[PDB]
Amino acid sequence: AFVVTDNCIKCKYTDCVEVCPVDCFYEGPNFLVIDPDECIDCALCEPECPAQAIFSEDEVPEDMQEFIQLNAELAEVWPNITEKKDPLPDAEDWDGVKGKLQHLER
Ligand code: SF4
Numbered sequence: 755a756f757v758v759t760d761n762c763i764k765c766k767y768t769d770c771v772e773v774c775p776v777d778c779f780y781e782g783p784n785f786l787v788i789d790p791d792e793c794i795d796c797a798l799c800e801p802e803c804p805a806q807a808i809f810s811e812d813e814v815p816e817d818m819q820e821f822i823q824l825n826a827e828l829a830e831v832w833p834n835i836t837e838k839k840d841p842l843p844d845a846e847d848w849d850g851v852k853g854k855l856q857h858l859e860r
């Protein structure tokens with residue numbers, strides 16, 4: 755599975771959904787997650803994230819380990835997203851800010 759980690763929060767560019775062959779991205783107010791059961795690990799989405807927020811599960815930084823189980827849980831409750839949309843309004847003011855998990859919205 756590939757995993758979306760911290761820098762997606764309040765950026766949510768959605769460039770990643772274009773390239774997904776299986777449509778396994780699920781949409782929240784200010785973040786996207788990958789459903790781990792659906793993901794086929796094609797790795798096509800991770801060059802496409804402008805925030806460089808996507809990682810192979812086995813490469814998730816030590817300090818972002820929580821995001822693996824978070825993707826799995828929120829994928830069960832959030833709606834599937836299959837079309838790119840516009841980035842959140844202030845997405846590049848927040849791109850690269852560390853510690854954005856405290857801003858996640860359900
Ligand atoms: S690795 Fe492939 S299947 Fe998995 S979320 Fe990314 S593009 Fe979709």
Ligand code: F3S
Nearest residue numbers: 762766768769770803
């Ligand atoms: S910022 Fe998030 S919405 Fe997709 S393109 Fe990157 S994982």
